C-alpha cells in the first residue's frame, strides 16, 4: 500500500483580478493491489472577500477539477497529462442593476507529477493555464507533505 499526502497552496492570479492565494490543494492516489495503476485529482478552492470602497461585491472563486489515471512509465517516475477547468464565478454589481458577464467555464489542461524522496516527505507539482477573454491567468500547485 502507499498514500501520498501533500501540503501546498492554491494560487490563481489574472491580468485584471489578482485573486490572492486564499486556498489550498490536496490529492489522493491509491495503488491498485493488482496493477501498477494510480489516479490523481487535485481540488483547489481560493476565496478572498472584497469590499473597502463603499460596498461593491467582487466575489469570485477559482477551483480546478483535475482528473485522470497515473501511468507506469519504466522506473521511478509517473506522469499523466490531465484536464482541468479554471474560471471565475459570482459577479460585481451590488447596486440593484446586475451585470453578469464573466462566469462560464473555460478550458484548461494540467499534468500529474508525483515524487517521493523520503518516508515522511512527498511533493507534487501541477501547472494549469486558462484564457478568460484575453485575461492572462496563471495557476500552479506546489507544497510538501508526508509519505505513507
Swiss-Prot record:
Record bears the keyword Nucleus: no
Source species, domain of life: Bacteria
Pfam families in alphabetical order: OMP_b-brl
Gene Ontology cellular-component terms listed: cell outer membrane; host outer membrane
Keyword Nucleus appears in the UniProt entry: no
Entry keyword set: Cell outer membrane, Membrane, Signal, Transmembrane, Transmembrane beta strand
Membrane-topology descriptor: Multi-pass membrane protein
Subcellular localization(s) per the UniProt record: Cell outer membrane
Periplasmic topological segments: 1-2, 32-36, 73-76, 117-120, 148
Membrane-spanning intervals of the chain: 3-12, 22-31, 37-46, 63-72, 77-86, 107-116, 121-130, 138-147
Chief location category: membrane
Record topology, Extracellular segments: 13-21, 47-62, 87-106, 131-137
Family: Belongs to the outer membrane OOP (TC 1.B.6) superfamily. OmpX family.
Protein name: Outer membrane protein X
Organism (species): Escherichia coli (strain K12)
Taxonomic lineage from the root: Bacteria, Pseudomonadati, Pseudomonadota, Gammaproteobacteria, Enterobacterales
